Scaffold this motif. Structure first.
Motif, PDB file in Angstrom:
ATOM      1  N   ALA A   1     -21.914 -32.799 116.662  1.00 49.03           N
ATOM      2  CA  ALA A   1     -22.237 -34.111 115.846  1.00 49.03           C
ATOM      3  C   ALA A   1     -20.785 -34.546 115.456  1.00 49.03           C
ATOM      4  CB  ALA A   1     -22.786 -33.930 114.548  1.00 49.03           C
ATOM      5  N   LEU A   2     -19.689 -33.869 115.559  1.00 48.87           N
ATOM      6  CA  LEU A   2     -18.261 -34.419 115.407  1.00 48.87           C
ATOM      7  C   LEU A   2     -18.168 -35.346 116.653  1.00 48.87           C
ATOM      8  CD1 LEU A   2     -16.131 -31.627 114.222  1.00 48.87           C
ATOM      9  CD2 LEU A   2     -16.719 -33.818 112.867  1.00 48.87           C
ATOM     10  N   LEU A   3     -18.372 -34.619 117.944  1.00 49.31           N
ATOM     11  CA  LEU A   3     -17.959 -35.274 119.231  1.00 49.31           C
ATOM     12  C   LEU A   3     -18.898 -36.586 119.587  1.00 49.31           C
ATOM     13  CD1 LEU A   3     -17.817 -31.990 121.400  1.00 49.31           C
ATOM     14  CD2 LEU A   3     -16.094 -33.633 120.767  1.00 49.31           C
ATOM     15  N   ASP A   4     -20.240 -36.326 118.841  1.00 46.57           N
ATOM     16  CA  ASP A   4     -20.985 -37.732 119.050  1.00 46.57           C
ATOM     17  C   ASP A   4     -20.453 -38.707 118.096  1.00 46.57           C
ATOM     18  OD1 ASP A   4     -22.807 -36.316 120.415  1.00 46.57           O
ATOM     19  OD2 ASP A   4     -24.239 -35.989 119.012  1.00 46.57           O
ATOM     20  N   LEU A   5     -19.916 -38.401 116.734  1.00 42.50           N
ATOM     21  CA  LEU A   5     -19.401 -39.595 115.940  1.00 42.50           C
ATOM     22  C   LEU A   5     -17.980 -40.090 116.816  1.00 42.50           C
ATOM     23  CD1 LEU A   5     -19.377 -41.198 113.513  1.00 42.50           C
ATOM     24  CD2 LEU A   5     -18.194 -39.284 112.389  1.00 42.50           C
ATOM     25  N   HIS A   6     -17.333 -39.172 117.222  1.00 41.83           N
ATOM     26  CA  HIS A   6     -16.168 -39.729 117.928  1.00 41.83           C
ATOM     27  C   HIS A   6     -16.357 -40.635 119.005  1.00 41.83           C
ATOM     28  CE1 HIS A   6     -12.370 -39.721 120.324  1.00 41.83           C
ATOM     29  NE2 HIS A   6     -11.684 -39.112 119.196  1.00 41.83           N
ATOM     30  N   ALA A   7     -17.515 -40.418 119.887  1.00 43.10           N
ATOM     31  CA  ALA A   7     -17.910 -41.175 120.909  1.00 43.10           C
ATOM     32  C   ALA A   7     -18.484 -42.581 120.247  1.00 43.10           C
ATOM     33  CB  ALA A   7     -19.031 -40.674 121.756  1.00 43.10           C
ATOM     34  N   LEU A   8     -19.085 -42.366 119.256  1.00 43.67           N
ATOM     35  CA  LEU A   8     -19.582 -43.925 118.530  1.00 43.67           C
ATOM     36  C   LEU A   8     -18.468 -44.585 117.978  1.00 43.67           C
ATOM     37  CD1 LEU A   8     -21.635 -45.535 117.476  1.00 43.67           C
ATOM     38  CD2 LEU A   8     -21.572 -44.240 115.389  1.00 43.67           C
ATOM     39  N   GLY A   9     -17.323 -43.939 117.388  1.00 44.16           N
ATOM     40  CA  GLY A   9     -16.140 -44.655 116.939  1.00 44.16           C
ATOM     41  C   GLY A   9     -15.234 -45.357 118.165  1.00 44.16           C
TER      42      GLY A   9
ATOM     43  N   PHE B   1     -10.644 -32.413 112.174  1.00 46.69           N
ATOM     44  CA  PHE B   1     -12.017 -31.850 112.396  1.00 46.69           C
ATOM     45  C   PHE B   1     -11.983 -31.017 113.724  1.00 46.69           C
ATOM     46  CE2 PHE B   1     -14.890 -32.531 108.815  1.00 46.69           C
ATOM     47  CZ  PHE B   1     -14.128 -33.623 108.167  1.00 46.69           C
ATOM     48  N   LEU B   2     -11.624 -31.694 114.677  1.00 46.85           N
ATOM     49  CA  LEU B   2     -11.856 -31.157 116.184  1.00 46.85           C
ATOM     50  C   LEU B   2     -11.312 -29.938 116.402  1.00 46.85           C
ATOM     51  CD1 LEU B   2     -12.184 -34.251 118.593  1.00 46.85           C
ATOM     52  CD2 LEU B   2     -13.794 -33.407 116.954  1.00 46.85           C
ATOM     53  N   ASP B   3     -10.128 -29.765 116.172  1.00 43.11           N
ATOM     54  CA  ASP B   3      -9.092 -28.532 116.441  1.00 43.11           C
ATOM     55  C   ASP B   3      -9.728 -27.521 115.434  1.00 43.11           C
ATOM     56  OD1 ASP B   3      -7.186 -27.173 118.188  1.00 43.11           O
ATOM     57  OD2 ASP B   3      -6.035 -27.029 116.342  1.00 43.11           O
ATOM     58  N   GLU B   4     -10.155 -27.770 114.134  1.00 39.82           N
ATOM     59  CA  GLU B   4     -10.556 -26.952 113.179  1.00 39.82           C
ATOM     60  C   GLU B   4     -11.643 -26.199 113.824  1.00 39.82           C
ATOM     61  OE1 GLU B   4      -7.839 -29.252 110.698  1.00 39.82           O
ATOM     62  OE2 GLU B   4      -9.080 -29.692 112.552  1.00 39.82           O
TER      63      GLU B   4
ATOM     64  N   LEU C   1     -23.369 -37.060 108.753  1.00 45.76           N
ATOM     65  CA  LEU C   1     -22.745 -36.047 108.827  1.00 45.76           C
ATOM     66  C   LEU C   1     -22.152 -35.202 107.736  1.00 45.76           C
ATOM     67  CD1 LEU C   1     -20.905 -34.452 111.284  1.00 45.76           C
ATOM     68  CD2 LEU C   1     -19.000 -35.840 110.776  1.00 45.76           C
ATOM     69  N   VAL C   2     -22.022 -35.910 106.483  1.00 47.32           N
ATOM     70  CA  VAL C   2     -21.971 -35.347 105.233  1.00 47.32           C
ATOM     71  C   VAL C   2     -23.000 -34.400 104.793  1.00 47.32           C
ATOM     72  CG1 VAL C   2     -21.658 -35.777 102.640  1.00 47.32           C
ATOM     73  CG2 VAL C   2     -20.254 -36.946 104.428  1.00 47.32           C
TER      74      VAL C   2
ATOM     75  N   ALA D   1     -17.185 -32.099 103.961  1.00 46.15           N
ATOM     76  CA  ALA D   1     -18.044 -32.873 103.526  1.00 46.15           C
ATOM     77  C   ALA D   1     -17.143 -33.850 102.534  1.00 46.15           C
ATOM     78  CB  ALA D   1     -19.189 -32.353 102.681  1.00 46.15           C
ATOM     79  N   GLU D   2     -16.380 -33.335 101.900  1.00 45.48           N
ATOM     80  CA  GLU D   2     -15.532 -34.158 100.714  1.00 45.48           C
ATOM     81  C   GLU D   2     -14.527 -34.825 101.584  1.00 45.48           C
ATOM     82  OE1 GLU D   2     -14.423 -30.958  98.199  1.00 45.48           O
ATOM     83  OE2 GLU D   2     -16.438 -30.757  97.212  1.00 45.48           O
ATOM     84  N   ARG D   3     -13.944 -34.690 102.456  1.00 44.53           N
ATOM     85  CA  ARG D   3     -12.898 -35.450 103.177  1.00 44.53           C
ATOM     86  C   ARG D   3     -13.774 -36.285 103.863  1.00 44.53           C
ATOM     87  NH1 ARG D   3      -7.711 -34.301 105.133  1.00 44.53           N
ATOM     88  NH2 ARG D   3      -8.014 -31.983 104.621  1.00 44.53           N
ATOM     89  N   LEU D   4     -14.887 -36.296 104.327  1.00 43.99           N
ATOM     90  CA  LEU D   4     -15.585 -37.359 104.925  1.00 43.99           C
ATOM     91  C   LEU D   4     -16.101 -38.472 103.780  1.00 43.99           C
ATOM     92  CD1 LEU D   4     -17.768 -35.224 107.246  1.00 43.99           C
ATOM     93  CD2 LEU D   4     -16.568 -36.991 107.837  1.00 43.99           C
ATOM     94  N   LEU D   5     -16.492 -37.817 102.663  1.00 39.64           N
ATOM     95  CA  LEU D   5     -16.658 -38.890 101.599  1.00 39.64           C
ATOM     96  C   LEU D   5     -15.415 -39.502 101.019  1.00 39.64           C
ATOM     97  CD1 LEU D   5     -18.967 -36.390  99.883  1.00 39.64           C
ATOM     98  CD2 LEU D   5     -19.874 -38.511 100.593  1.00 39.64           C
ATOM     99  N   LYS D   6     -14.262 -38.991 100.970  1.00 38.48           N
ATOM    100  CA  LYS D   6     -13.166 -39.714 100.658  1.00 38.48           C
ATOM    101  C   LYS D   6     -12.790 -40.768 101.708  1.00 38.48           C
ATOM    102  CE  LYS D   6      -8.123 -39.024 100.008  1.00 38.48           C
ATOM    103  NZ  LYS D   6      -7.103 -37.926  99.924  1.00 38.48           N
ATOM    104  N   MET D   7     -12.926 -40.575 103.079  1.00 34.67           N
ATOM    105  CA  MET D   7     -12.936 -41.499 104.017  1.00 34.67           C
ATOM    106  C   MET D   7     -13.751 -42.593 104.080  1.00 34.67           C
ATOM    107  SD  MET D   7     -13.940 -42.551 107.205  1.00 34.67           S
ATOM    108  CE  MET D   7     -14.795 -41.259 107.914  1.00 34.67           C
TER     109      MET D   7
END
Ligand SMILES: [Cl-]
Ligand SMILES: [Cl-]
Ligand SMILES: [Cl-]
Ligand SMILES: [Cl-]
Ligand SMILES: [Cl-]
Lengths: 171, 171, 171, 171, 171
Positions: free
Chosen positions: A108-116, A132-135, A18-19, A61-67
């Motif tokens: 891709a966000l929805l797919d990652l949410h489903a995996l989580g 991410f989702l509401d943005e 996703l990054v 991307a930077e927020r994902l990398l921080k996480m």
């Protein structure tokens, strides 16, 4: 490592992918912005709209990398493909390409949410919900509003737009 | 005189000719500005755009004359020819004539830079780099942006312009 | 060392020689300043004019030394010769000696610029253009203006000077 | 055109000729100003006195051009002859040439006023009375005051000037 | 009476007639303003443009009446005829009627000035020069500018207007 807890290898890898997708999207918006700055295109507000989205996608991307580091995963970078076009046509063409791009990010966000959720990773799921989702929903709604307005102008539509712009109160 | 050092007669003469060219350009923009103030033309923003360029070109001539004296050359003034037209047509016609004028100034600057470099006159070369070359590149880019916008309006182009102006954020 | 790139031994040595020339010039202006502070000379504004130039020339040497280290060259100091005179005559004599000194500095700057251009060292060339060449042109123009005014006073010249000073607006 | 009323072709043409005369005068003062900035002339207050008059004469031309358009006449520009001299001598020489120039402008203003009165054009006559005639009388009086002071200095005159300057209160 | 001096009966009567003309013009602009406030016309900026001119014309009448008393003449009022139309058409129609009205006022001012000059009444002539003649020239120039702009819009003209309005700097 010393910190990793409830953080699957599947989620770690999907966050790295996703990054790449967000950095690709940033690159696409960089290209869109400079195209509208060409002297033979010369639509400054369209340039500024896309250059701001380049910044937003790189910050995502930077927020994902921080996480990834907060959870004890390891950031892995891949090659970044160039954008799909070198020239982007009209404002209408560009806005339609932007909505397609944003739909792809949202999926891709929805797919990652489903995996989580499948991995029982509530921190990951809340992270995506909160940042991410509401943005994405708000941005796609704005782009759809813009598309309708551009379409009513490049087709009585000219009239209705100008009345709304020049007589009625708006932000 | 007492001060002259590394300042060729060729550069001195070419600076006097460039002063004439800049004062000619100022005169041309004075004429353009008053034409757009006529009651049968009446485009105030076009008047103001050209009257400001008249000021800029006279200030460029004055900076060259200051530099001529700083180097110990002697200012020599020649007759100033009147502008090429008495009436300037449409905004599109006028903007096309302005780009031709600015191209001619830019070429004269580049030719003087080349003479300074041949004469090993780095003060002259830096003076033009620092005070003239980028001013011309930026002005020609702005005029090209304006030309594209005027062309899309005096030909869906009307629509795209109005959307960019009235919906999107711009300076 | 670890940092040196595109920085010739010829330029490095010529920068060390130019530091010596600037420190020599500073020493000469220190001497000029204290001579005009003598009770049998007693021209305070002439003292202050030269003591300020001593400061400017030492600051020029320090900027060259900073640049030598920024490029990875090594500062090497040599003996500093004493000034050419112990007593400096009249204000006119002193101003003529100052113009000769400034011409010599300007020629050394132009020679170093030519060496940098031959060595394809654009950082060196821009450094001299940006920090030295115009400072010298402006200072030599001011000294030439002063020389003309002193000459018209120590020879109707007295009259024209006083009118310009006491009736007309000036800085 | 749509607006022209009580505005003779004779006045329209004479206004265009007076614009040429004012722009010529501006050019002459530009030349005077840069001559007094030469390092071998070096009278800063004399430079500033003439460079300010260049600005005033160009602003007078611009006010005439504005008025030409307010009345519905059409601005027509002609070639601008170079100034009568390349070098301007002493401050006394220059001030005498400036008074001759201002006398010539004043006579042209008075001649245009007489034509307006003959044409029963009170707007033109008041325009010249309100914006030009007293400006010229005041400027010519100042130049005559300066001429007397320069003459008493470049000939007991030196004494009387210095007393007035250095003991008595003045602006 | 006790105060009257150099004030002809002819000028006194002509001032009373000009008051009637100015009050008639004010009435005409009152009518124009309320016509553009109708719900079936609904052009607020056109309403405001004419209602402001109603105020200006009544203030002109009041300044004439003040002057009549300052000179010792006697104000005499006549019936005020209604405006020439009950409905005023388009903005273009209305602006053309306004220019005709202003031309008629300007001619009456010029005729009164000519009578004052024939009567050797310089106070009257200066009063009109100072308070009326340039106000009329400026207003007629503005109306002519507006007419040209309305004509280029109600006929590439739409384009050129919008560019000048929305891209270029103007008051
Ligand atoms: Cl690819
Ligand atoms: Cl010509
Ligand atoms: Cl020695
Ligand atoms: Cl000539
Ligand atoms: Cl009636």
């Amino acid at each position: 490592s010393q910190i990793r807890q409830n953080y699957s290898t599947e989620v770690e890898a999907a966050v790295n992918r996703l990054v790449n997708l967000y950095l690709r999207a940033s690159y696409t918006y960089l290209s869109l912005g400079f195209y509208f700055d060409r002297d033979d295109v010369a639509l400054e507000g369209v340039c500024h709209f896309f250059r701001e989205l380049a910044e937003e996608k790189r910050e995502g991307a930077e927020r994902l990398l921080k996480m990834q580091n907060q959870r004890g995963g390891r950031a892995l970078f891949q090659d970044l493909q160039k954008p799909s076009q070198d020239e982007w046509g009209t404002t209408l063409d560009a806005m339609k390409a932007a909505i397609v791009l944003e739909k792809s990010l949202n999926q891709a966000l929805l797919d990652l949410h489903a995996l989580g959720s499948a991995q029982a990773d509530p921190h990951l799921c809340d992270f995506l919900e909160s940042h991410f989702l509401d943005e994405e929903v708000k941005l796609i709604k704005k782009m759809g509003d813009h598309l309708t307005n551009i379409q009513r102008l490049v087709g009585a539509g000219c009239g209705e737009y100008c009345f709304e712009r020049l007589t009625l109160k708006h932000d």
